[PDB]
Amino acid sequence: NETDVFLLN
Amino acid sequence: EVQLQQSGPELVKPGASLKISCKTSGYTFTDFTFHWVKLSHGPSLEWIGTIKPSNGDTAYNQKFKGKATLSVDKSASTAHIEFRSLTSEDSAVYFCARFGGSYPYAMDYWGQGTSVIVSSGTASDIVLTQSPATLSVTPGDRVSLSCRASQGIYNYVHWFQQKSHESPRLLIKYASQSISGIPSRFSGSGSGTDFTLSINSVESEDFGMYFCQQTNKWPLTFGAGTKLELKA
C-alpha cells in the first residue's frame, strides 16, 4: 500500500 | 458543481516549452491530488504524474521526468503542467484530473482535455492486461471486460469509459464500488489479479473505449483498453 499516504491521507 | 477547466488548444515549434493549465471551481482546491494523463492513438492512456496541491509534493512516471514539471498556483486555484524540448512525440491530448470524491478517493472529475500539436512546419511497473481487446456486439447483449494484473493489487482497480471526443469517465472504483450518477448496468468484481467490468445490457450510448487503472503501486498504470463496438 505504497500510494495510500500520498493519495488517500 | 465541481469543474476542472483546461486552457485551449496549443500549436508550437519543436524545441519549445509550453505551460498548460487546469482551473478548478465548486470545491476547495487544496483538497485532492491532481493528475495529468496523456492520450495517444488507440486511444491509449498514460499517467504522467501527480501533485498534492496542499504542499506541492509530486510523484512522476519516470518516462516523463525529463519532459514535464507539475506545479500549482493556490491563489488562482489552478494546476499547471510545463513541457520542455517539445518534439513530434509529445503531440497529444493532455487531461488533468482530481483524485477525490467520497472516501476512498478516485479520479472522479476530469478536465475537458487540451490538444497539443508540436508542428513539423511547412520494468517493475504493474502491467494491466485487458481482454478481449475488441467486443463487437448488438445493443441488448450482456458483456464482461477483463483486467488481469501482473501481481496482486488487492482491490486497487478502477474502471473508465472513454467515448470519442470526450474525457474519461469513472465507472467503478476499488474493483466493485459504485459511482453516483453511473447507470446500474455497470458493475465490477474481483480482487488480487483478476478484475471484471460487467455491462448487464449494452446500450448504444456505451460504445467506446474501456480502460482499467491500478493505484496500488507507483507509477499508476492503465491497461491498453477494450474497444466496445457495434457488430457490423
Numbering used by the authors:
A (entry chain D): 532 to 540
B (entry chain A): 1 to 122, 139 to 248
Paper text:
The hepatitis C virus (HCV) glycoprotein E2 is the major target of neutralizing antibodies and is therefore highly relevant for vaccine design. Its structure features a central immunoglobulin (Ig)-like β-sandwich that contributes to the binding site for the cellular receptor CD81. We generated and characterized anti-E2 MAb DAO5, which specifically recognizes a linear epitope comprising part of the CD81 binding loop and the E strand of the central β-sandwich within HCV E2.
Diffraction-quality crystals of these antibody fragments were obtained in complex with peptides spanning E2 residues 529 to 540 of strains J4 (genotype 1b) and JFH-1 (genotype 2a). The peptide interaction with the paratope buries an area of ~730 Å2 on the peptide and ~650 Å2 on the antibody, with a total buried surface area of 1,379 Å2 and a shape complementarity index of 0.801 and 0.774 for the J4 and JFH-1 peptides, respectively, similar to other antibody-antigen complexes. Both side chain oxygen atoms of D535 form hydrogen bonds with the hydroxyl group of YL32, highlighting D535 as an essential contact residue for DAO5 binding, whereas in the E2 structure it forms hydrogen bonds to the side chains of T534 and T526 and also to the main chain NH group of N532 and G530, thereby dominating the main chain conformation in this particular region.
